[PDB]
């Protein structure tokens, strides 16, 4: 209503119910908007974000609606700290979810997680919107086990100069020259498929970031997780061509994943 723009949520409409944990920006809480709608309330610590630039981008991010993207509902910008209000994902981070051995996942479930992320990425690619930090830690899981991509493009507003740079999810042209493109998101997606089929292992787990950078620069790569079929491995490996222009698009990766779901059903 009055005094609130389309991207602005009145904080008085929030009911705080439980603490979910602490992220890089601060505390995340589960709550309700206008007494009945589930939301996650992200409290942004002062000095951690380029707030004015983020607020302007929030307007664009609210227009990015896809069932496999963690929806941005709005921002509470009139106070310190500011809040980012998003879709609630009851099962938390994909990385922690993969690491919980109790789930005893079938490979069909792992491929479905890949397809969830790929559909979100295909959507972002259709809108010429880069994620810029795609990785399992940036995906969330809802109460139905659906995986959704979160914090798309948010790395552009991080003030900590340490960003902790995602060396292990970066292609040679990013490490060598800072060349970000649709093709650096493609590379990151391949690493994410590897994280999923490896049940949340750290990519290049025996190497430091410096060693990872040198390994990649020499044209060497991650290798096949035990749970990946030959066809699944061919798809993740296709994301890692040295030449960015030889890497597929998300539309092609989606077509590949759907083909493997059919063949290996
Ligand atoms: C063992 N446990 C059982 C119940 N679990 C949780 O209670 C739970 C835990 C975290 C998160 C979570 C749920 N939901 C969100 C959301 C969201 N938009 O809903 C965003 C960020 C995080 C988030 C991500 C990284 C670090 C800290 C955090 Cl907070 C979480 C899930 C796992």
> Under 8 Å CB-to-CB from 36, ≥6 apart: which residues?
none
Q: What lines the ligand 1 site, CB under 6 Å?
A: 20-21, 23, 28, 40, 70, 86, 88-89, 91-93, 96, 140
Expressed in angstroms and rounded, the spacing between residue 72 Cα and the centre of ligand 1 is 16
- What residue spans define the domains of the chain? 1-88, 89-265
Q: Resolution in angstroms for this experimental structure?
A: 1.6
Mutational pocket test of ligand 1: of 17, 88, 89, 92, the residue with most ligand atoms within 8 Å of the beta carbon? 92
Look at domain 1-88 and name its CATH class: alpha beta
Task: Locate the ligand 1 atom nearest the alpha carbon of residue 137 and give its number.
Answer: 25
Examine domains 1-88 and 89-265 and report if their fold is the same: no
Q: For residue 187, which of 134, 118, 231, 147 has the smallest C-alpha distance?
A: 134
Instruction: Calculate how far, in angstroms, residue 87's C-alpha sits from the geometric centre of ligand 1.
Output: 12
Please identify every residue annotated as catalytic: 133
SS (H, E, C) 64-132: CCCCCECCEEEEECCCCCEEEEECCCCCCEHHHHHHCHHHCCCHHHHHHHHHHHHHHHHHHHHCCCCCC
Q: What is the 234 CA–ligand 1 centroid distance (Å)? A: 32
As a dihedral over the C-alpha atoms of residue 131, residue 132, residue 134, residue 138, rounded to 10 degrees, the angle is -80
**Technique of determination:** X-ray
Closest-CA residue, ligand 1 atom 29, reads 21
CB 69 within 8 A of CB 120: yes
- Long-range contacts of 226-229, Cβ-Cβ distance < 8 Å, separation of 24 or more: 227/107, 227/110, 227/197, 227/198, 227/199, 228/107, 228/193, 228/197, 229/107, 229/260, 229/264
Whether the CB-CB separation of 38 and 61 falls below 8 Å is answered with no
Alpha helices in the chain (DSSP H): 51-61, 94-99, 107-126, 172-177, 182-197, 209-217, 230-238, 250-263
* 89-265: CATH number: 1.10.510.10
């Amino acid at each position: 209503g009055l005094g609130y723009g389309s991207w602005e949520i009145d904080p008085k409409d929030l009911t705080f119910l439980k603490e979910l944990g602490t992220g890089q920006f601060g505390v995340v809480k589960y709550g309700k908007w206008r007494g009945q709608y589930d939301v996650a309330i992200k409290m942004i610590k002062e000095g951690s974000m380029s707030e004015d630039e983020f607020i302007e981008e929030a307007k664009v991010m609210m227009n990015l609606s896809h069932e496999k993207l963690v929806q941005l509902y709005g921002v509470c910008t009139k106070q310190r700290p500011i809040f980012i209000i998003t879709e609630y994902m009851a099962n938390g981070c994909l990385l922690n979810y993969l690491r919980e051995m109790r789930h005893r996942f079938q490979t069909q479930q792992l491929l479905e997680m890949c397809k969830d992320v790929c559909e979100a990425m295909e959507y972002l690619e259709s809108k010429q919107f880069l994620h810029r930090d795609l990785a399992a830690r940036n995906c969330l899981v809802n109460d139905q086990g659906v995986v959704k991509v979160s914090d798309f493009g948010l790395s552009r507003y991080v003030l900590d100069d340490e960003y902790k740079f995602p060396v292990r999810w970066s292609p040679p042209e990013v490490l060598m020259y800072s060349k970000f493109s649709s093709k650096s998101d493609i590379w990151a997606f391949g690493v994410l498929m590897w994280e999923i089929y490896s049940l949340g292992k750290m990519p290049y787990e025996r190497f430091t970031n410096s060693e990872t950078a040198e390994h990649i620069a020499q044209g060497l790569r991650l290798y096949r997780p035990h749970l990946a079929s030959e066809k699944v491995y061919t798809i993740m490996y296709s994301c890692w061509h040295e030449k960015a222009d030889e890497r597929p698009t998300f539309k092609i990766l989606l077509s590949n994943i759907l083909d493997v779901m059919d063949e290996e059903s």
